[PDB]
Design a protein around this nucleic acid. Sequence first.
DNA 1: ATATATATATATATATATATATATATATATATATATATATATATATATATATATATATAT
Length: 109
Amino acid sequence: NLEQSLLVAILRQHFVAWEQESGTGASQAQIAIDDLLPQLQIYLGDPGSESKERTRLLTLLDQLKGHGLVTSPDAHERIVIRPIIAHLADPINLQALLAWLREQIAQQT
DNA sequence: ATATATATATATATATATATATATATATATATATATATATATATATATATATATATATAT
């Protein structure tokens, strides 16, 4: 669904950046929930509270964990991006969706 | 020539996620009910002071 596609796109881009700064496969990718929530709000809208944002993010993260794309939240509220994303099917479609989104976030308001 | 078989379209089923309504269960605050200390009523023994009265003194 749309939200899941956004989350995979975001994590794909951040993983790619991580491989730029660290090299490919040298170190596991990590990110904080507080760094993801702002972009989910940016690209989807406010559900009503920080608690609802966190609940939505947790549900999505569980869903991806089902596909083997993300680990569970850890003591730092951080998560690890599973390297399986490097072999995803159609990353260019993800880029197209991200461009569509950054166009909609502007046109809509 | 009749019938065969694959590619095509479409009607139906299956998977998955979101949200809502649900069932089981815990805990809470509420009300019924019981127990109690306490005061007040009913009954009683013992006795006094009393009203009614017998028995009675006194009277015509």
